[PDB]
Amino acid sequence: TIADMMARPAQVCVERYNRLLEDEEKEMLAEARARLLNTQGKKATR
RNA sequence: GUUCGCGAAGCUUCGUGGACAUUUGGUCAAUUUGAAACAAUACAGAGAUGAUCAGCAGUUCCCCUGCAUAAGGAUGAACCGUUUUACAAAGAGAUUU
Numbered sequence: 515t516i517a518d519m520m521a522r523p524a525q526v527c528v529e530r531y532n533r534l535l536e537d538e539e540k541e542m543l544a545e546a547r548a549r550l551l552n553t554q555g556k557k558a559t560r
Numbered sequence: 561g562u563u564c565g566c567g568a569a570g571c572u573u574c575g576u577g578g579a580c581a582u583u584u585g586g587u588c589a590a591u592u593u594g595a596a597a598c599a600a601u602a603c604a605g606a607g608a609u610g611a612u613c614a615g616c617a618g619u620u621c622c623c624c625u626g627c628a629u630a631a632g633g634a635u636g637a638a639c640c641g642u643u644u645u646a647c648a649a650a651g652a653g654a655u656u657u
């Protein structure tokens with residue numbers, strides 16, 4: 515509620531109050547890139 | 561043929577005038593060439609979305625099954641692509657008269 519009132523996120527607000535591998539990456543990125551770019555599927559490609 | 565009359569031969573038989581009854585059927589003609597479809601082989605192959613799947617519609621000079629204004633057909637079929645002008649105004653530079 516406090517966070518909402520602020521317009522801030524919650525965890526950060528709370529913190530403030532308190533105060534006072536590579537291969538996988540490569541592969542996933544490749545996949546992701548393919549996905550985001552390609553406006554395709556079964557019917558579009560076919 | 562039925563018969564109701566006339567005229568000849570022996571009620572029986574020929575020859576006649578009438579009356580009765582009167583125009584069917586085909587948009588077609590019997591095997592390839594006036595248009596049935598499935599099936600089969602081969603080849604691919606399943607709406608969004610990353611994937612899997614439901615259902616509903618929509619457009620059409622596409623239909624099918626269905627008694628159907630039910631319902632169902634690959635989301636039933638094809639739609640997913642191509643896509644450059646009622647086109648003017650302002651500024652700068654260049655060649656021709």
Ligand SMILES: [Mg+2]
Nearest residue numbers: 614615634635
């Ligand atoms: Mg279906």
